[PDB]
Design a binder for these strands. Structure first.
Lengths: 88, 94, 68, 94, 68, 75, 75
RNA sequence: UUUU
């Protein structure tokens, strides 16, 4: 399964993003591209020491700064089910 | 890639910030982006017992991936990771 | 709207202030563009040390902001 | 392609990869690609008591961008042929 | 880029992002700012630390080239 | 481009610099022209009219509706 | 054309300064446009921090990834 | 805008 296929399938769903600088972003994935640039909606930004928190209506994140994304198990399940039916 | 050799098996990723995360390799691409499922992080230290954090589905951007090891199930069964101590893995310095 | 590089192109011959991602700045007369600056002052914004340059080629990779 | 080709000739021989996080891993080179990503088999971490994390890993993928060095026995390198290949690569790139 | 002609063959100061300085005659320059110098002196904390008879400097490290 | 004109935005750069300003232009590489810029120091300083280089951006968000909140996560 | 300097060092001993307070002296047998290199009979000097100590190691054959290279000179 |  390709990673960008999974990322595109989590559009519309909650997501957790951690950046190289150590900040984390919790929000709904509104859109993404093959650069892994993200636009998120209704976001909580957490500073690196877990000290301070901001609410952002939406935000844009450059993909080159992402360390990793956390995605719900059901998204992975959905993509696997669709690919295994597309096989037939 | 040679990573195709590891598909659908338990794998242990060392990232550029020194973290250790284990999980099932569900996919990768030519930049070494990875999908791990049923993943968890292991924090081995010298001062305290090993911590295990559950992570679920984990998409790792390849830029941040240093190593991907295939975990040998028998070797890992022989090890009691609870009582294991070790140094923090250093950060990658470019 | 306005186009960043058209604004910078407008700045040729005028004074430009450049802010790096690191704590360094340069201020000089923009010659062209990686940018060439003339009669430049380099500022280390942590140590406070300042240095002068008659003319220099500034690598563009580390520049954050350009300010007319 | 010069160093990708060079590393292919070292497949099946023992190498030590020093990484930019100061870990070094010894093992049999099994695979290499255009990025100089490398796959080692039957690895042993050089300072294993410092880094017990890979005690259950035998096969290992290393991303090419995190390599500092690969060092290898001179016995499997023909430096006359290597230098000639280098000159032909430079000429091809002219 | 009339800077090049004005600078190739004359003494230059090269500052790396790390802060280490190299002074020497500039043999050659390219788009990534890879340099070749002819008798380089290296300065760390401002002190002369090494002398190289010729030097290739990899451009990703170069912060600037300034004329002397 | 998956992404404010004349609205005030906040931007974060690799290396940590953090600024706000009114978006007055942009291009496809995501260079920005921001006016009335203020840099948040690591307190503020005022930079006026700035061109930001898109390659150094990490984050862009609108200022309207952005607020500091207390910890929202269940301990 | 800068790389022509390194062309003149093929099969000659070079000094290489690397990021991370590391230095190499060895015989250049191959390089490419990234400054990937293979050195034969190489000595590495690692400086540990005024220096606290230096560590010297010898390698019969050594591939060096180019992105660590700061400069290349005669020894 | 991920491995020079």
């Amino acid at each position: 399964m390709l990673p960008l296929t999974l990322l595109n399938a989590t559009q519309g769903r909650p997501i957790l993003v951690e950046l190289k600088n150590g900040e984390t972003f919790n929000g709904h994935l509104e859109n993404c591209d093959n650069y892994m640039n993200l636009t998120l909606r209704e976001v909580i930004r957490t500073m690196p020491d877990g000290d301070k928190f901001f609410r952002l209506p939406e935000c844009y994140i450059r993909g080159n700064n992402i360390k990793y994304l956390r995605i719900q198990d059901e998204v992975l399940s959905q993509v696997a089910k669709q690919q295994a039916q597309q096989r037939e | 890639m040679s990573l195709a050799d590891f598909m659908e098996q338990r794998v242990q990723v060392i990232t550029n910030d020194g973290r250790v995360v284990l999980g099932s390799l569900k996919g990768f691409d030519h930049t070494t982006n990875l999908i791990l499922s049923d993943s968890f992080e292991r924090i081995i230290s010298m001062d305290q017992d090993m911590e295990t954090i559950p992570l679920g589905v984990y998409l790792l951007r390849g830029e941040n991936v240093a190593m991907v090891g295939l975990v040998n199930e028998e070797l890992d069964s022989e090890i009691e990771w609870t009582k294991i101590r070790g140094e923090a893995i250093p950060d990658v310095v470019h | 709207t306005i186009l960043p590089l058209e604004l910078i192109d407008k700045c040729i011959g005028s004074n430009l202030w450049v802010i790096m991602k690191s704590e360094r700045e340069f201020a000089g007369t923009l010659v062209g563009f990686n940018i060439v600056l003339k009669d430049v002052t380099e500022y280390d914004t942590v140590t406070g040390v300042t240095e002068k340059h008659s003319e220099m080629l500034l690598n563009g990779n580390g520049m954050c902001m350009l300010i007319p | 392609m010069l160093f990708y080709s060079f590393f292919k000739t070292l497949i099946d021989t023992e190498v030590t990869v020093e990484l930019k996080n100061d870990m070094s891993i010894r093992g049999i080179l099994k695979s290499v690609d255009q990025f100089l990503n490398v796959k080692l088999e039957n690895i042993s971490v050089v300072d294993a008591s410092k880094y017990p994390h890979m005690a259950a890993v035998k096969d290992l993928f290393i991303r090419g961008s995190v390599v500092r060095y690969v060092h290898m026995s001179s016995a499997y390198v023909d430096t006359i042929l290597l230098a000639d290949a280098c000159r032909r690569d430079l000429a091809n790139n002219k | 880029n009339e800077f090049l002609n004005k600078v190739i063959g004359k003494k230059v100061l090269i500052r790396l992002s790390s802060g280490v300085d190299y002074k020497g005659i500039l043999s050659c320059l390219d788009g990534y700012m890879n340099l070749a110098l002819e008798r380089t002196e290296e300065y760390v904390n401002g002190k002369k630390t090494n002398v190289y008879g010729d030097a290739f400097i990899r451009g990703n490290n170069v912060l600037y080239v300034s004329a002397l | 481009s998956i992404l404010y004109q004349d609205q005030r935005i906040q931007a974060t750069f690799t290396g940590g610099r953090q600024i706000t300003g009114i978006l007055k232009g942009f291009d496809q590489l995501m260079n920005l022209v921001l006016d009335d810029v203020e840099e948040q120091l690591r307190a503020i300083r005022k930079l006026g009219l700035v061109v930001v280089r898109g390659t150094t951006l990490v984050l862009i968000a609108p200022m309207d509706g952005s607020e500091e909140i207390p910890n929202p996560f269940v301990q | 054309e800068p790389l022509d300097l390194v062309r003149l060092s093929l099969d000659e001993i070079v000094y290489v300064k690397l990021r991370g307070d590391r230095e190499l002296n060895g015989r250049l047998h191959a390089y490419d446009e990234h400054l990937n290199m293979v050195l034969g009979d190489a000595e590495e000097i690692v400086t540990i921090f005024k220096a606290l100590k230096t560590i010297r190691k010898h390698y019969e054959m050594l591939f060096v990834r180019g992105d660590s290279v700061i400069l290349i000179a005669p020894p």
